[PDB]
Amino acid sequence: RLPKARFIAKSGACNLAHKNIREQGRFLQDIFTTLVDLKWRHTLVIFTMSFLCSWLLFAIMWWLVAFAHGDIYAYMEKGITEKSGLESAVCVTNVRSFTSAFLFSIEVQVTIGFGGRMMTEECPLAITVLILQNIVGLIINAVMLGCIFMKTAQAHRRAETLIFSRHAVIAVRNGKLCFMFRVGDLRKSMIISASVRIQVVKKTTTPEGEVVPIHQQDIPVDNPIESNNIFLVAPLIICHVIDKRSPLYDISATDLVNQDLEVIVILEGVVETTGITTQARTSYIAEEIQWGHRFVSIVTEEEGVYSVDYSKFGNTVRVAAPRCSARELDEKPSILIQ
Amino acid sequence: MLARKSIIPEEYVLARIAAENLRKPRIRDRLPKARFIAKSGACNLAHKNIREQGRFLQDIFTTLVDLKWRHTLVIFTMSFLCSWLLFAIMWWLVAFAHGDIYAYMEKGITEKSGLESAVCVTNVRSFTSAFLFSIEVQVTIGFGGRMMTEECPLAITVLILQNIVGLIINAVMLGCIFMKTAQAHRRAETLIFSRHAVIAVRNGKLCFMFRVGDLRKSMIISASVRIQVVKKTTTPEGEVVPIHQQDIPVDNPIESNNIFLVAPLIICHVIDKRSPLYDISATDLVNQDLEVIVILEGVVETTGITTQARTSYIAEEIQWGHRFVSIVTEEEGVYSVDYSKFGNTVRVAAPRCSARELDEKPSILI
Ligand SMILES: Nc1ncnc2c1ncn2[C@@H]1O[C@H](COP(=O)(O)OP(=O)(O)OP(=O)(O)O)[C@@H](O)[C@H]1O
Ligand SMILES: Nc1ncnc2c1ncn2[C@@H]1O[C@H](COP(=O)(O)OP(=O)(O)OP(=O)(O)O)[C@@H](O)[C@H]1O
Ligand SMILES: Nc1ncnc2c1ncn2[C@@H]1O[C@H](COP(=O)(O)OP(=O)(O)OP(=O)(O)O)[C@@H](O)[C@H]1O
Incomplete structure (x- = not known):
């Protein structure tokens, strides 16, 4: 409709x-x-x-x-x-x-x-x-x-050139659920000082009564160093780990498909050849988020050099993921931990 | 014109050193x-x-x-x-x-x-x-x-x-x-890197150091240093991350990734728990599938163009136990540096254990 x-x-x-x-x-x-x-x-x-x-x-x-x-x-x-x-x-x-x-x-x-x-x-x-x-x-x-x-x-x-996946994944990585997506590059050069930012769109309210209409926020993209610069020559899988303080923590698993959320990805950088700052955007919604899936690897060793093949960029196979909310795994171990 | 019409010679005898020398390896790694x-x-x-x-x-x-x-x-x-x-x-x-x-x-x-x-x-x-x-x-x-x-x-x-x-x-x-x-x-980029990397001993823990310098009489503004380790890993749940790039802190007085580039420098990297270099020992560090990347970023004030300079290190080039000779020397009236001592390294007292154990066995002695 x-x-x-x-x-x-x-x-x-x-x-x-x-x-x-x-x-x-x-x-x-x-x-x-x-x-x-x-x-x-x-x-x-x-x-x-x-x-x-x-x-x-x-x-x-x-x-x-x-x-x-x-x-x-x-x-x-x-x-x-x-x-x-x-x-x-x-x-x-x-x-x-x-x-x-x-x-x-x-x-x-x-x-x-x-x-x-x-x-x-x-x-x-x-x-x-x-x-x-x-x-x-x-x-x-x-x-x-x-x-x-x-x-x-x-x-x-000529035109924007950073390419984001058809859809994303929500896997299990290192004993806690993680939200992952795939970003690739088609250029000949590489993006200097690239940066990635992730936002959660949700209609919100504040406990004391104010009303926020299409409010933004921000989710901490993870690196082992707490920093956001990323170097993109191979296709990458950007990941974000669910903490008690991200708004992506109290959601369930089965009932994500019927849930009002949106994930915005903004990737900025400066092209080295011509020196023009560029920003490319994309978004993932509830209808196009496949829970419990995970991406297959695409970089292999061809005995002369490493080799990747973007033809297999968007394929994604399903593997194990527990059927509980990403809260149930820590509030009550006996509820989820096994 | 029809060199080998007489095809009769076949399987008479060859019986030779082709690989049955027995004193030379048959294999050719190449x-x-x-x-x-x-x-x-x-x-x-x-x-x-x-x-x-x-x-x-x-x-x-x-x-x-x-x-x-x-x-x-x-x-x-x-x-x-x-x-x-x-x-x-x-x-x-x-x-x-x-x-x-x-x-x-x-x-x-x-x-x-x-x-x-x-x-x-x-x-x-x-x-x-x-x-x-x-x-x-x-x-x-x-x-x-x-x-x-x-x-x-x-x-x-x-x-x-x-x-x-x-x-x-x-x-x-x-x-x-x-x-x-x-x-x-x-024109182009002219950032000069040292090629060989030492793992000395300094300030109670090991290091990871090289040298970098410029040639253009314009120094580079807002220069940033990033160091990453390239290795294949898998999740404990077992997924193949084909060439995982891991970011590792480069030490500094306030833990920030800018560097001021006028006289050449040592770029330390203290090995600690989170670092992937926790688990590498002396005789180990000739055999390993690792690649450590270094990424230098800045702008040149003259032309006003952002520049990014890349290099790569493998475990085979890195030579444990060394450090870099003090290239500088207070001259007659003004400091100076001889870039001719760029790739020169010297050896000094180097523990042979792993930093994994350089706190496990708590004696600075190895
Ligand atoms: N190997 C490739 N070569 C060129 N462009 C690609 C390649 N892979 C992905 N893209 C671009 O990235 C975007 C996302 O592709 P993705 O694989 O996520 O979607 P898809 O479901 O495969 O799309 P389609 O059904 O059109 O193949 C696409 O719009 C496409 O233009
Ligand atoms: N719709 C608009 N278009 C352009 N500028 C705007 C607009 N709304 C506000 N501004 C800027 O914000 C400031 C609003 O100050 P001002 O005193 O004009 O508010 P106002 O017009 O009385 O508000 P309202 O009309 O909603 O009661 C102005 O400086 C103006 O430049
Ligand atoms: N005086 C110099 N001028 C230009 N480049 C230099 C100089 N010294 C070292 N380099 C750079 O160091 C890198 C390593 O080169 P190489 O190992 O052949 O020499 P080195 O041992 O570092 O220095 P030297 O040649 O003075 O012994 C090279 O890429 C080279 O460009």
Whole structure:
């Protein structure tokens, strides 16, 4: 039926729905930012279209400025008269058609300037138009150059690359139940200063009466040294041991599948090749937690080097796990201990 | 040609030293060795049978940005030459079709005409001229003895197409050059490690020590030291953890994992109960399947890039009973260190028992 709520999905990307946020209006800086945040298939198109539109716009202006002076009349009557009676008076030499104005604009801005179409020193309006057009062309070229530099810089990153298991396990390890999951890497480099944090999502209350709605917490990931940095070259099985103080201690075994909990995993680090800090997220819910199972080993010795095979990443076989809550194993040994 | 037609000689006699020498072992171990990471970085694992994700052209561009400086110039030059040539051929075909080549040849064979009033693209007469006109249009030179009259609109289309593509080429190549010039400090990493490891006696318990130093005149900031032991174990309930990496404390005055790296240092590691080195003895520590990894992290203030340096130790290289010679020495007016005494180790009084028992038998004597 209607889906029961999750906090963050099976592919990260927190599903929260902020609503009625007090928003301000438009900051055109946001539009420019969209300009730099683009796809190449569209960046190339707008890049070309800017130049095409600019040339056409200044071509129409150039035709008008060739219209104002006595230019078109002179070049239309010279053909009839076949007389060189218009040698020097014209405003922009040999500009006599909208096509010719368009060609002159192309010549002037990309700095081609073939030089058969000279620009005299007479019509001040024309000199104003030339100054304006040259400045606009310089600005446009600089902006697009900046766009290309940002594109090249943001080329290297492709997509998130740290991979978490289909589901997790809850095994028995060293005389106390432990929550385990599997994390792997697909990169060529390795993640510097990697860190892993685990959280328990549960709707909670406080004994004195306050109400906490989607409260977070944190569960102590274990190392023999009480520290959280982890080095990831082989696929790893992150583990967390159940103590009396984690909220993952009073749950039962059979009745986990019908129980309101969520386990969020956050893995951060800094990539060595390009030096960009990254954070990858995932979550496990009640429906996708297989109690009492355990992961099979995947690293073996191939007589030349160690060898692992991620094709067998998510397979998980069931082995022994006592049918009691992780509390019953310590409050009353005779209840569980055997 | 048919070397061994006469096949008759078979099983007459061989009867020889092939393995029945009896004074030489028949076996040939051949001594192959596998370590978790090579002695000089380059983690050597074996990923295979991974569900592949195909390829995408953005990866080709990503390769374009990451090239050695002796290939960027080559791809630059090839790109420029190919572009000029391609548009030269387009211009040559345009000149051919519109009847310009014939007009120029016929009216220049006899100079009587001098007619250039009806031509598609003036003063293009050969492929040489077309491959000099395309030069004058792409690089924004514009020599201008060859105007483009306004008539033939196909030529104008070609000019628009070529100018825009030329700008694209110029912008992309400038971007590549700038990106490679900005990230030009980033040569490589030059962290120097001692190779041999001692287990001396100091401060009432054993140790685990080596030496590390830099070469760049910039010291490394927020340097952190991590030491791990690689071994295969199983749960008491019996599950194969294939290559368990166990973290072990590196001692320090306040138990924190930063180190300040200016003069080379000893990196101690006191063996205590939790440490996996509790159970290793003198004659034992030549035979063992263990690999101790060391991970050094920091940033270099000059380039502003985070760096991670890796090395690996095996039980075979580690030589019990030694320590490191005091490389430093107060000189005439200023301290100094001779890195030439890097791998040099000396021997001194070394107990031969295990730290497992160096508290069990409570006599500092062994
Ligand atoms: N919805 C919101 N959007 C943006 N900023 C907010 C929002 N709510 C609170 N803030 C920030 O918190 C502070 C709230 O102070 P303020 O005195 O405006 O509270 P308030 O608006 O009276 O609260 P309420 O409207 O809920 O009664 C402000 O500085 C504001 O920047
Ligand atoms: N060998 C592999 N090669 C490439 N990607 C992998 C590999 N193993 C796992 N992944 C990635 O890790 C994620 C988790 O895979 P997992 O094995 O946990 O799920 P799964 O049930 O095997 O998924 P599927 O049913 O699609 O095979 C997947 O989305 C997948 O993209
Ligand atoms: N003066 C030095 N310059 C550069 N590297 C050094 C120097 N001294 C030692 N090393 C490093 O120490 C590591 C061990 O090398 P090796 O065992 O061949 O020499 P060593 O005994 O440590 O020192 P030496 O060669 O001075 O006797 C090498 O990786 C090497 O790079």
